[PDB]
């Protein structure tokens, strides 16, 4: 018959790594996790206590409560036509700080800095971000770069 357990179809998903098996480095435990920190959930096969479900591998969440050795995470889960709020308890081995939020914070610092310097002269610093614009004109010169003409090649078997 059919077989739907907790770790069904997780063969390669919780497979450890290439050449990284064994005890985990202690930067994973030295970390400090606050309420409201944005985290991603990558499991660790060695640590069996406090593993998440397969459904949350690679899913990013936010910390709501913190415990002695583990951490609670808020996850929104698509079921039906909606998002149902899901709460997970995870040891800090299967949780790592989401770096996605981080580059926005460094953007705020420059964004706050540029406005502060701009108001001294009022130049409309244009703090927004722009997408990649179409290129503008240029002059390409042929000193020592004279064009060389290429032609289609005939057929050969090479075997």
């Amino acid at each position: 018959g059919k077989s739907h357990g907790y770790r069904s179809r997780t063969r390669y998903m919780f497979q450890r790594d290439f050449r990284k098996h064994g005890a985990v480095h202690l930067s994973t435990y030295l970390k400090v996790y606050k309420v409201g920190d944005i985290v991603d959930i990558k499991a660790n096969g060695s640590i069996q206590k406090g593993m998440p479900h397969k459904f949350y591998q690679g899913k990013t969440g936010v910390v709501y409560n913190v415990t002695k050795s583990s951490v609670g995470v808020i996850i929104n889960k698509m079921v039906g036509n909606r998002y149902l709020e899901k709460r997970l308890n995870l040891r800090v081995e299967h949780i790592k700080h989401s770096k996605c939020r981080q580059e926005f914070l460094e953007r705020v610092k420059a964004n706050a800095a540029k406005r502060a310097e701009a108001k001294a002269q009022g130049v409309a610093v244009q703090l927004k971000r722009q997408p990649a614009q179409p290129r503008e004109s240029r002059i390409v010169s042929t000193e020592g770069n004279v064009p060389q003409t290429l032609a289609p090649v005939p057929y050969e078997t090479f075997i």
Partner: protein, 294 residues
């Protein structure tokens, strides 16, 4: 030829970290010694680090950070001579004094010298450092011994008893001190009290100072030259115990040099890499010499 490994075996070998390869860090235990309760977000889980080596006793208090472990206080046994200890810096009594030298030293810079005086009279009673009323909840540190094995009478635990007598709140049990009884689950303080003062080396001084002289002249010679006898083996350590409490200030040394001349004299005795151009010119010469039919 026999100890030849294929490229298939070598490629897939995952090396131990760097100090598992040196047999230096029992990471399985260290994982317990530095991992903090998360709700204590940034509190440093300090650690009484005593590591035993030939000809020296090393005592340091260490916490752990991601970029590396941090030490605030260090006590050694080669700095005990300032208290009048030049012989036997590697016994259970010197391993005691360092636990007392560090305790005053680490409590100095913490400002907790006025309180938590510890056990001023040396008696050997198993007594934890009690928490004083409306006081700063005395300083808490923990042993790590590493790969050394815990037994009864091990000299790693002269450092702990040397620390609690200094006021450091180190949790411990009384069953691993020398003098503990296996038949009846208790310890006799009198026999332990001697070992604080060197009880084991005490009687062996006078018992063979007169019976055997050929041996007693080869070793224990420094005691003979310095005229140290068995009866004075206790009051010299009493001076140190009151010397530790007097000046734990831990003045540094002069190094007889600076950091620059230490490197400058050592840069000329090392060996350096061979240049990429030099390697190829070394390859070409060997071809023309060896394969060139002389």
């Amino acid at each position: 030829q026999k100890d030849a490994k294929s490229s298939a075996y070598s490629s897939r070998f995952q090396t131990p970290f760097r100090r598992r390869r040196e047999g230096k860090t029992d990471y399985y235990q260290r994982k317990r010694l530095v991992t903090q309760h998360k709700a204590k977000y940034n509190t440093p889980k300090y650690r009484l680090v005593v590591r035993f080596t030939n000809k020296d006793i090393i005592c340091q208090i260490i916490s752990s950070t991601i970029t590396g472990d941090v030490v605030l206080a260090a006590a050694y046994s080669h700095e005990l001579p300032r208290y009048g200890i030049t012989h036997g810096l590697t016994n259970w009594a010197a391993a005691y004094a360092t636990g007392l030298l560090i305790a005053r030293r680490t409590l100095q810079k913490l400002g907790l010298d006025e309180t938590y005086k510890g056990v001023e009279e040396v008696e050997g009673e198993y007594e934890l450092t009690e928490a004083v009323e409306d006081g700063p909840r005395p300083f808490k540190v923990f042993l790590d011994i590493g790969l050394q094995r815990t037994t009864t009478g091990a000299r790693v635990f002269g450092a702990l008893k040397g620390a609690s007598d200094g006021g450091l709140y180190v949790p411990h049990s009384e069953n691993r001190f020398p003098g503990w009884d296996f038949e009846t689950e208790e310890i006799d303080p009198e026999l332990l009290r001697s070992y604080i003062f060197g009880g084991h080396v005490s009687q062996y001084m006078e018992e063979l100072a007169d019976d055997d002289e050929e041996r007693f002249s080869e070793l224990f010679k420094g005691y003979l030259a310095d005229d140290i006898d068995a009866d004075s083996l206790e009051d010299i350590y009493t001076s140190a115990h009151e010397a530790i409490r007097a000046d734990p200030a831990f003045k540094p040394t002069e190094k007889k040099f600076t950091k620059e001349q230490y490197a400058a004299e050592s840069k000329k005795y090392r060996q350096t890499k061979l240049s990429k151009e030099e390697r190829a010119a070394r390859v070409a010469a060997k071809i023309a010499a060896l394969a060139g039919q002389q």
